[PDB]
Design a protein around this ligand. Structure first.
Ligand SMILES: Cc1ccc(-n2c(C)nnc2-c2ccc3c(c2)N(C2CC2)[C@H](C)C(=O)N3C)cc1
Length: 123
């Protein structure tokens, strides 16, 4: 297991926009409670999974636990950076696995909900 993505960076400019507040309070916390959220609530544990291949394939890992900590630390400058982290998490899953795999069906259900929730954001 490599070190998880950084969730604090002080040479980084921080913002709390209305959109970022919404991404934490509404978007992430709704996804967090989805029945299929749990594989995505923390980094892939390759050691537990006995998947020495995973981090040899996925070079920019991302998960909702990391995103949640970033949002709580005001890590992001704008909502687009946070949405990009969500999109990296989903894309990683689609890259490493194959269409129709169980974990892909879970990611697809979360992404459907994610896209529903971010279709309209605060002003
Ligand atoms: C369907 C399913 C769902 C979760 C697990 N699992 C258990 C247990 N403990 N940790 C997990 C778990 C958590 C996240 C992922 C995966 C398994 N898969 C595996 C499965 C390919 C790959 C590595 C992937 O891209 N992601 C996002 C194992 C199977």
């Amino acid at each position: 297991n490599p070190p998880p993505p950084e969730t604090s960076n002080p040479n980084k400019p921080k913002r709390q926009t209305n959109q970022l507040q919404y991404l934490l309070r509404v978007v992430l916390k709704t996804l967090w409670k989805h029945q299929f959220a749990w594989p995505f609530q923390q980094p892939v544990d390759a050691v537990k999974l006995n998947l020495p291949d995973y981090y040899k394939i996925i070079k920019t890992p991302m998960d909702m636990g990391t995103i949640k900590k970033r949002l709580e630390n005001n890590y992001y400058w704008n909502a687009q950076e946070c949405i990009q982290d969500f999109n990296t998490m989903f894309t990683n899953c689609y890259i490493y696995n194959k269409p129709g795999d169980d974990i892909v069906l879970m990611a697809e259900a979360l992404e459907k909900l994610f896209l529903q929730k971010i279709n309209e954001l605060p002003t």
